[PDB]
């Protein structure tokens, strides 16, 4: 009722208008939580998608769709206490070192870095906060796998592996191993891709997977699912 | 629709 | 080699002393006082404007101004009486999980997954709010921050360590170590000489700010501790945990006094706070509402059921006039 | 080996502190609650004339 | 007498289905959905148009009962305007929901920019105004004429009569049957062709079941609209070309076609609200 009260109300309304404008922009952004073990290839993939043609947040635009990748690699703490703030993320990108089936060094020894990736994937894919959240699984450095599969046998990592020690069989077997840990098949989808340092293939795959996720979410919204 |  | 079993003997002796210390445990002596009765707190204000999950709020010492933090990347100063927004502070990192209000009102602090405590100058020249200090040095996530005065702030991080900072210099003056899990909450004493921190160890430690040394250690929870707050007189504190149990510890008795649990409650505690008299303990839950407990009776007195998602933050005004609850549905409600 | 001895000395400091029987400190908490019972609008609802909400 | 009571009973049942279905949709929207979603906004608009169109019915049934208009000139005008206006609004809301689903499926990136509740309200208001563009001319243009022993609701005939009659009938036929059918058929065909490539649908047996279910709702909605609106328009066009003698069979067929046109609006809440998976979660 007072003059300064009216001025305060007007300032509050202008703040509300700016908040609404900021909220529309935030909504137009696609957030992709980036996850992976040590030396998995997360940073390399981000750099590739930038130059193809604490938290390290990376924002870039492709085909009028704006991706916003959030990497939590530098953080050292228990993940369940902060994985809940990433709930509602459009998708999850998981990076796997496809040639790391025998590079198990990490801390001390016998770390099983490939099995470390498997256990991390089991933890996050089956996480209660990501039941309806799809995953984009990137399998990195496939050339290294091709040139090592003919020298180091895959059985050193998977003793139950039966088959030829050739790149295609190894790649398919590792993809199947990563996909079988998805114990919620009717609620989420895993998009598997073999990364390559070429003219905009990783970003194209991300765009296509995000487009499919958006279509699924819209089908949920428009009342058909 | 038409009127009767 | 001898150190391990001598430490076991030391813990045995501490447990024996605590067991000999206990004779009543608040149960045989508070049965003669009248129950608080049913309490119905009604919503007075609904603060709208946040567009994501609200993770922290903190009342100002004037009991009117209020700061809230959400995943929007926005810090909003609210006028609780008129619902008017005093400020809207953008954040360089939207992954904020804590916020604090300086007792003088000149500053607000926020922090989160960016490993940085940012200090924002509110009552400055030039108009708009500007960031003054970014306190770096933690290696986890800041789960709580509290102002001692305009120049001293205490933080708890996910790297199992609490720190005290000199804001002007931007450096840690003393580091509090001893927790083996992520420290999740803080609470300063009324005289700001001691503070208690709850961690993922299911343990709460009482530190001394001057010497930076842990004075006492409190156990009893079976899961992660998410919330902590002192009694008004500063001689006790209450904790909230993931096992759906609230407990009241005692500084002078060096042991747990009361337990606040219910069979129908299976969800963890997100926030706890006391009323101005300390008779009521208000706890925020994951079942989308708040429970008002009788701190001396362990009886449940009321429910603040007004939120459609998990109640993540909660505070009581310095004069005890109102309770503000913020939740993941992007709303704050003021109850009275 | 340093963590063990640090834990032992921390327990040495923690063990040698003065304890008061819980019947006394609980009584002190009850007395504090009783003395400040009136000055608690949440505990005792306040008339709407002086209620700022 | 038997034909008249048959018409009355069928008409009364149609009225009941329209009123109660639409009012139930209204109550569910105002208590549970909270009008916070674009699809809920569209369903609310469809329910409103269908409710008013069905509420037009009892006046017409009474008029055919007595062969006279007892409600006066003012009522005659508002009932005629409500009938035409609400038929147009219902058809345009069907088209708008079809186009909204087409955008949500086949153009997902732009649906982020467009599919917001404010845009839903804007397009609803625009459709209401566009239908007012024909509701108001017939509101001012409807009149009451006197006969020897009857009172009839008719429309004034600006000279010439034949040109005006043909223009009105052709406009209603084009903008109420041909355009909505083309729009919904094209949009749903493209939407199905796109949905055949969605990886969460072209998957296991459950996902194939989901895809078949979605295709079933799409095709059943299109078929319901076509079967409910083709016969009446075809029959009124046939009557306008060649005069039809008035017999029992002609009368019963005419009234059945009218009833089918109204059962379109009666069925709309069943197809767009009760079978909507968002509503099924509302207990």
Residue numbers in the entry:
A (entry chain A): 5 to 57, 183 to 354
B (entry chain P): 1 to 4
C (entry chain B): 5 to 340
D (entry chain G): 9 to 61
E (entry chain R): 65 to 347
Manuscript text:
Activation of the μ-opioid receptor (μOR) alleviates pain but also elicits adverse effects through diverse G proteins and β-arrestins. The μOR is the primary target of opioid drugs used in the management of pain, acute pulmonary edema, cough, diarrhea, and shivering. Here, we present the cryo-EM structures of the μOR–Gz and μOR–βarr1 complexes, revealing selective conformational preferences of μOR when engaged with specific downstream signaling transducers. Integrated receptor pharmacology, including high-resolution structural analysis, cell signaling assays, and molecular dynamics simulations, demonstrated that transmembrane helix 1 (TM1) acts as an allosteric regulator of μOR signaling bias through differential stabilization of the Gi-, Gz-, and βarr1-bound states.
To further understand μOR–Gz coupling and signal transduction, we prepared DAMGO- and endomorphin-1-bound μOR with dominant-negative Gz for structural determination. The μOR–Gz complexes were purified with scFv16 to facilitate cryo-EM studies, which yielded 2.8-Å DAMGO–μOR–Gz and endomorphin-1–μOR–Gz density maps with clear densities for DAMGO, endomorphin-1, and most side chains of μOR and Gz. The overall architecture of μOR–Gz closely resembles that of μOR–Gi (root-mean-square deviation (RMSD) of 1.0 Å for Cα). The μOR bound to Gz exhibits conformational changes similar to those of μOR bound to Gi, with an outward expansion of TM6 and a downward shift of helix8. The α5 helix of Gi/z inserts into a similarly sized intracellular pocket of μOR (about 11.3 Å in width, measured by the distance between Cα of I6.33 and E8.48). For the βarr1-coupled µOR, the most evident changes compared to the Gi-bound µOR are a 3.0-Å upward displacement of helix8, a 1.3-Å outward movement of the TM7–helix8 hinge in the cytoplasm, and a 1.1-Å net inward displacement of the entire TM1 segment; the TM1 inward displacement is 0.7 Å relative to the µOR bound to Gz. These three changes — upward displacement of helix8, outward movement of the TM7–helix8 hinge, and inward displacement of TM1 — are also observed in the endomorphin-1–µOR–βarr1 and –Gz complexes relative to the endomorphin-1–µOR–Gi complex. In the endomorphin-1–µOR–βarr1 complex, the B-factor of TM1 is similar to other transmembrane segments, whereas it is significantly higher in the endomorphin-1–µOR–Gz complex. In the μOR binding pocket, endomorphin-1 occupies an additional site compared to DAMGO — the TM1-fusion pocket, formed by TMs 1, 2, and 7. The Phe4 of endomorphin-1 fits into this pocket and participates in the dynamic regulation of downstream signaling by TM1.
